[PDB]
Amino acid sequence: MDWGTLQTILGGVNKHSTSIGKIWLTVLFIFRIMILVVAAKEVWGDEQADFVCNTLQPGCKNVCYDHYFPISHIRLWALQLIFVSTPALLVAMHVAYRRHEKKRKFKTQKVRIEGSLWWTYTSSIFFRVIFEAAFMYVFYVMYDGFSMQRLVKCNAWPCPNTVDCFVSRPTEKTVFTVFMIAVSGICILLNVTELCYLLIRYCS
Amino acid sequence: MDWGTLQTILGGVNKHSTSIGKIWLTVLFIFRIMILVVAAKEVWGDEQADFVCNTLQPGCKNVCYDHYFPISHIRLWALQLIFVSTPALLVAMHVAYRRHEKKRKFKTQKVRIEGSLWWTYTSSIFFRVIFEAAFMYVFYVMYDGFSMQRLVKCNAWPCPNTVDCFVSRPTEKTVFTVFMIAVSGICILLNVTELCYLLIRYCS
Amino acid sequence: MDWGTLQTILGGVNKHSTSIGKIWLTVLFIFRIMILVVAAKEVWGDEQADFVCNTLQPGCKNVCYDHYFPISHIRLWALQLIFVSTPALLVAMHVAYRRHEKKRKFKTQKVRIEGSLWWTYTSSIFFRVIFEAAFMYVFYVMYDGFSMQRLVKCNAWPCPNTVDCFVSRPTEKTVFTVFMIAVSGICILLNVTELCYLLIRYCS
Amino acid sequence: MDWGTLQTILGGVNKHSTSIGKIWLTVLFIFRIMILVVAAKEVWGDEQADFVCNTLQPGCKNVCYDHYFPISHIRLWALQLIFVSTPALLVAMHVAYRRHEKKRKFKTQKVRIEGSLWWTYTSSIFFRVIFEAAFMYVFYVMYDGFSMQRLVKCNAWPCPNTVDCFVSRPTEKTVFTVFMIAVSGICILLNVTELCYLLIRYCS
Amino acid sequence: MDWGTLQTILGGVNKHSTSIGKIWLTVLFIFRIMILVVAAKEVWGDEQADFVCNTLQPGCKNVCYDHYFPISHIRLWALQLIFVSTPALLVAMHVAYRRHEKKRKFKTQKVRIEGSLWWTYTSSIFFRVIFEAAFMYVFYVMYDGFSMQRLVKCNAWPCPNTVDCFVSRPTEKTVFTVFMIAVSGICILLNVTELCYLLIRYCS
Amino acid sequence: MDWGTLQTILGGVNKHSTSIGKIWLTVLFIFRIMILVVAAKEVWGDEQADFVCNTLQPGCKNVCYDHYFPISHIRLWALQLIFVSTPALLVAMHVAYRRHEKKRKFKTQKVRIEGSLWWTYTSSIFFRVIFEAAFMYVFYVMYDGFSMQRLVKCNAWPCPNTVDCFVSRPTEKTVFTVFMIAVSGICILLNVTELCYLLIRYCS
């Protein structure tokens, strides 16, 4: 996945995740980012190049592909990954800033949420759940479910009447779409349990 | 985004941003640079290859694409990012130079603007606001709003009369254009508040 | 293989493998990841570009390629490598966590499985065997053996009657498929012997 | 811009630039090299692929492109950047060599030109000015100004009579050509002032 | 050759090669891996794209290319390099493991083979010779000598009768094939002399 | 130029070059390797893709390109650079090995050739001159001078009679060929003077 300096970033975030945030970070890096960069991205390489329409109308292929794929699946996943990673990155900085200041004023134990960290950790989990569900909704309603069809019927101008068009690798894209949605749903469940851990402690 | 040496550069600039400059740096790196290199750039990959014109005139596609896209959006964003990052890069050097000299003559506290740093920080914010607004204006008047059309009508020589041409992925490009403009506008608001913080202190 | 930071990751996992896990790590990195990254991936570069069908029907090539290659071989291997590497990555973290805590409470000997590490090492080997056999089963039944044919007969809509189609580099792909399957079978045998080593110790 | 080891190279040259050479280094790295690698290079990607000539003569497109673009603009800029960077790279080594020997025989102050460094610094600036003006002259006379035309008229063999040919992205290339020339002219002015600083000191 | 971390790997293996293994490592890295990465690989880039067959039969080009190039030369060389490097990589670890343990139980001299290292070094040389000769044999009998022909005559189904086909860059591929074979033969001679050095010592 | 770890390699060789070998190393890295990687390589990208022949004979383009470009210019330069760099790389190791042993038995002065280093340095320069002249001869006689022609006349089978073919970017390739030859000739003169420095000392 290129870059090169994960060990600092991956190591930095790892040291500042309480109990489940370490499990969440593994699922995020290995099964969402690694899948996207190593397998999924090349699958969508020829999405418009291999888009085939049964017509002789110039410009009909351009508007039919645009109508049915307003935003690419891989571009949607890249935006979603950036949005869910930001609250985790910000909070991990807060723990390092809180720890450094106390050490300066003054035993590497587990990360504990006791003071001002409560309102930043709880909000970060809330933002992660909201962002994750928002992108799942966009995926469902924009593409009419998680299955890609071989044939799309298009009647936008300048296509005469209805034109038949054919998608490239629809089955492979369905397999990867289901994988991302399922892993995304797992991350939602992981975040909810972390809320349950915190809420019962406050209620107790 | 390749490179590899961000941790020094990102870490260096981060340590020398007062209060909002740290929020500004996050929005710049994560939501402007990361989007451009990971999602936006591949969207514009086939801008001229998939440009289709309904004509038989040789050379008509070349002049019509040039007329309606004098400079690509991604090339415009790359220039804008370079121009806004330079004042921040220079001032971060000034803080490190001011701090180092005092240490040589001789408590890592927050960055404070008290002496000659006042005329460099204030000018840096002023330049960033001016650069940000200048590029937003160029985007609006060159492309006639932030929405990309499916069809462009072209009558430049040697095209006979008016020729219909069709843009590649107009909807995807509109979505990313709105995202950059919205994030660019947020950075303008963040810079203005930093001016308000400094101006009231001087007025007090 | 790009990346750049194996030496930390490869060095980290190597130091925490008992006797056979060091042989397993060599076979995994050198004969599965190196083969896929350096040789296999470019073999599948033109899988659909050089797919040729004897027909004049628009859209027939798209549905016939999708029917016979629902998921690419290289994308299947990438998923399999990620799934088998995860249990080994997790357990290597457990050994480092178990060792670090003892040092904090307080002779670099070989890795020994005596306490809570028994239920994590044994499950890690069990998961690796199950994952390895599941992907070998998918390879066999999805593609009807490990040999790729030169000609595939396709009758899916919209292809009229049965259409003859021709695969790109079928012999090269067969050679690499047999190589990956054989190395995958070796890793299964290596894991089973490690179970035999542990089970006799518990039974004794 | 790939590479990865700038921090050593950029850091090394930065520490050995007197007053203006630090401003010169910023303009060189940020507005000449960064522009070339991030924006300019992809603009010239399809210079010959999208070169279109209104003719049926085989081989006419090859000789007409060669006639009007004997050497590409980006390749010209790459050569110019290498030539201007070499004198600065060499002199920066001289300062480090002069400083190291004094330390071995034996207060990090500003770089001062007093002894044998006078004839190396002065010649380095002179070579940089001469190289910069020579490449600006080549740009002007080879391409007949800094504006690229949409249409070129070609009559070289084997093209029959005069053939009309059309350039790819002429407006975008004009924008980047004007930018590089203007920044190159700024570097000339910066170097001349450094000569004025040194010459008055010697005359005094 | 991309990667980035040879200096650790190259430095590690270099420090653990007796007398000729240092000469062997230079020939392997510089004249086998560097040539393949930098020069040879791009020569085979258009092997099937520029494969031309004088026919109108659909699918005839696919089966004729497959028949005459079952596995590409560059893919064959990549497999051979991996197989010959593994015994050297493993033995270098044994020397470092033997040296480290004795130091822990307890003068950086030359590498000496006296104890258990005898059966690992001798087998490593034997495996390297066997692997090198096996791949040379495969190259000879698969491609009928080391010279690539311009024309190949193909009669496999569905090609009607015998079809003439033309290879891309046959002369350049012949030059690089002879270079690898000659360098491969040198490595065989180097390994044999190392056996002669060891065998006479044991016989004495 | 990718890679990433020149600073160790470039720094290592730099510290072990007597007087002229430092100038030689600069010319080699900056004006031979930099030019080839950054400018020359992309010029030859479409050498066969844009090779155009005025004919209807299938396979005629393949044999005519092969006849007139048996080895690519860039592939020739890559081989030459590897051959000339090897003697300098080997000798730099000898200086470090000779120096390290003295330190172990035991004032960083200039590199001096007094003992066994005489027969390795002198042979290294002799090999470099011989290799440099050998590749100059191959360039001249294989391509009939250093100027590339627009038109090549080809009569090899299966081309009927003589076929006219047209080269891609012949003028740009001539400019870079002359540059490499001139810089290569400078390196020959630099090596000869180093022989003159050594020979007079021995004769004295």
Swiss-Prot record, chains A, B, C, D, E, F:
Intramembrane ranges, chain numbering: 2-13
Binding residues annotated for Ca(2+), in chain numbering: 42, 45, 47
Pfam families associated with the record: Connexin (PF00029)
Transmembrane segments: 21-40, 74-94, 121-141, 175-195
Effect of residue 50 to N: In KIDAD and HID syndrome
Extracellular-side segments: 41-73, 142-174
Impact noted for substituting residue 75 to Q: In PPKDFN; the mutant protein completely prevents the formation of functional channels
Subunit-level organization: A hemichannel or connexon is composed of a hexamer of connexins. A functional gap junction is formed by the apposition of two hemichannels. Interacts with CNST. Forms heteromeric channels with GJB4.
UniProt name for this protein: Gap junction beta-2 protein
